[model samples]
Target: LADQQDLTRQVPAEVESLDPAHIESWTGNTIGLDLFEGLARIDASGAVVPGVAQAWEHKAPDTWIFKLRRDAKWSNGQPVTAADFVYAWQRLADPKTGSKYTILVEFVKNASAIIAGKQPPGDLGIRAIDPYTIEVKTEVPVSYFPELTAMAPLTPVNKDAVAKFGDAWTRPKNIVSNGPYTLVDWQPNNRIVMAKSDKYWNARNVVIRKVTYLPIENDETALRMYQAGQIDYTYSIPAGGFGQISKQFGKELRPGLQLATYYYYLKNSDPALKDKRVREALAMVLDREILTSKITQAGEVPMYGLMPKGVKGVQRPFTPDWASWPMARRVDYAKNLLKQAGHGDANPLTFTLTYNTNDLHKKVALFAASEWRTKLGVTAKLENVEFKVLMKQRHDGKVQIARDGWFADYNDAMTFFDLIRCGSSQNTVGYCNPKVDSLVAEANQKLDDGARAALLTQAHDLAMNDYPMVPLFQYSADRLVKSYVGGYTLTNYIDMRASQDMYLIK
Candidate 1:
């Protein structure tokens, strides 16, 4: 326990999966960053860097050729071949794979057809030219293709492992990884252990020999663990304890902006929310400043559009036309929209608001519901459930309106926009516009920054007008790291500093 080269940190909950194709949670993906090697990876500064692929060059506007490093090998001493990536990408696009991250590969050549069940996985345009060479073709010219390859979902998976164990391949003893570390043990709801992989290409440079993650769901518990020297860092700081922790543990706290949006998704099928007028009225009524300062009590920015500010390529998020109006005018217009939608004093608009059980989320929901009742004479029935239940209900489109949040997998604006695109599995809100999709599709093809930004702005303009999801605020990263830990920088907006990047100073 007193080992000089060991590191321990906290995650919010048990990792749902280790397979990159199946993992959807932040925790699972964080762990994946240590155990899986993608073609490219995002560094502490959030810039795309070569991973397994040591060198890459553009063959054409839509095609890329990569030269993988010969030194990279799986934990078991198998060379991490280009074929591994080809197979993993094919599995992601296969309809039978049922990966929710299929949206991530829609631009890959024939990936859309494969996901639609119109084509086979082998038709995907990625191929291993030889053992260490990879050629990838995209349906459109993707200037940020390297960044896309940095996502955990786009990382390589072992074909033989998946074929041997099926979904159980991710279990500790069966998992074969090609990264800085290999999974050594997993105790459900307790901790997961990883030891440095000697076969790693850069193992000599890896400072930490072992890493342990505590699945501490409660922020207070994580803070207590940090206090007792049981953990080196926390997953997040509780909103209520932000001020207290700041004063008591000033140097240990690392606070910065995160490229994420916390919003409420409205079910397009819900009778009450089906009306665009109703959705727009509800979207504009909430005072995000109040929610951020009074409720979250953290440094969070109010967001009016789905795309959060600070995305890598975009200048600024598209603000709704009415956002320039004063609050009094906005509130009056919201009432007008509600009335125009056929709900008035005699018959108030009513709907259920669903969210996962969290003290902060409850406060935000109560405030929004109270404002709706006072301003638009709308009645909201609040439903709070466990995180898993909320995820299922939202995924099933059973909830009328549900709280949701999204963090950028890469630094690109496309990560946020991809979720709302038509036919996206992530678009559980069922709000879609073919025109927005078209603009986004075009944006992906543009090589010039100005041209790309213009197309993205147009796309955001249409989405903001539709109010599919009411964007509330952009997040602020909050973590408590021990002063003795090095390489845990907070420069990246994605807040992704994995165990491999960190080292224990003592």
Candidate 2:
């Protein structure tokens, strides 16, 4: 007989931070889905579903009311209430908290002012009407505000644990979670072990008793572990090794669309990239066709615009006017720009490209470097560091040209446009444009869909023309799951998944 208590589900992931407020990576968010319960959740089929809030309704044009479930409780048996949401959101929006995703709450009433340190957190628009009732006010109609609540950044946090433990609140021994699983063990750089939380409102529906997530940065090793039957699921696969592994595990390989874009950002402050002509030269030389077809091999579309395809509220997809030009003409134009910027065969442009340590990044960087060398007579160096370390480097302005990605928080163009906004935390490349900035600010205030779309489109066009970042490709997860892992379907959002919805076949 199979033991009722077993560690049956093993996942190979790359986690950065388990703290909900501080988590900025997809891997960390994946683990968060098991440990935190948001007000709403995106279902496997990409539909919004009720979570802690049984149902929500609009009390006013911009006001949303939520009814908290009485049965929801923390891992320590404390009752989850509307106050938890209020407290968590305030903390996340407070400027002093240094939450990376604070911009997520920009639509919330007074949230923008609070994050700017002009208003107190108490003045923010979220409030607990009673123990079970919560009300929220947004600055605009915000059609997708409900979907934003599904992200980990908006999930409730335990006030008691946060107060007592401070930064250590997320430690396995002290953490209090309100999701399907509670943290039981955390061995850094190794794995995290979570056991089913009986205090969870829907605990009875959670089939897997325990889940172990291994932080495997090496895709080859992750694939080997899957092949060895040590892991049941792995989303990481090396670009060069994907073909071989997919062939061997033909039935297990899973590929699906992910609402994400992979791109390269240049530090505009650097003298080498300060000139718009220099930036445009570098951006134009990238042959995305060769990079996607030859290097990635995975079914990724070459991207010319920062905003990936399928974003709602935008009529026609826009790319650089020069994007469709023949490769030879584009390269020739790029050479002229380089020459105009004082770099040519005589003065070869040189810079180092830094990326997070992974087989895919390494391969992509090498190919890009080769393209720059072959087409523009540029010397591009490559540096690889751990993901966490790379984020820190980018934050501290240590990287000149670096790899970056933006996954949509909601199905909107604003998610992509916000990245390069002046002073935005995600804008590590020192990209600042008054024209783009005004358009973004204006778009957020305009409730009319068509007007807002026009503003955003203008901003996107200006940004792409300025060449602060070179859009490379839009990606798919290309995950590999064991055949027996049922109900494990890939969604558009990388971090959207529920363990309770999955069960072992045997």
C-alpha positional error of residue 449 in candidate 2 after TM-score superposition, expressed in Å: 3.2
lDDT of 1 by residue, 1-506 (tens): 12588888898767767888977777877888899989988877777788999989888988999999998898778889988998999999998887877877787899988999999999999999999999999998876688778778888988888889987788898998898999999998788999998998988878889889888756777788899999987888876677889999997889888998889989987776878888999988888877888778778888988777768667788777677778889899998887887875666878889987665678889998998888777888999876656777888998988988888877778888866888887888988899999998788777788889888888888888888878899887988988888876678788767677776665
Model 2 per-residue lDDT tens digits across residues 1-506: 13443443334335767778888877777789889988988766677888899989987778998888889999999999999999999999998998877877777899988998999999999989998998999987777778888888888999999999998888998999898999998998787898988899998778888888887777777777877888877765678566787788896887766778898978888887988999998888898888888888788888977777777755545588777899899999999988888877778778989988777888899998999988888888999888888887877789888988887877888787667888777777888898998987788778788998888888888888888888899876787777776776656454466666667676
Identify the runs in model 1 with alpha carbons over 4 angstroms from their true place.
1-3, 321-326
Top lDDT: which candidate number? 1
> Each model's TM-score, in the order given?
0.95, 0.94
lDDT of candidate 1 at residue 459, scale 0 to 100: 88
Error of 1 at 419 (Å): 1.9
Question: For candidate 1, which ten residues in a row score worst on lDDT?
Answer: 497-506
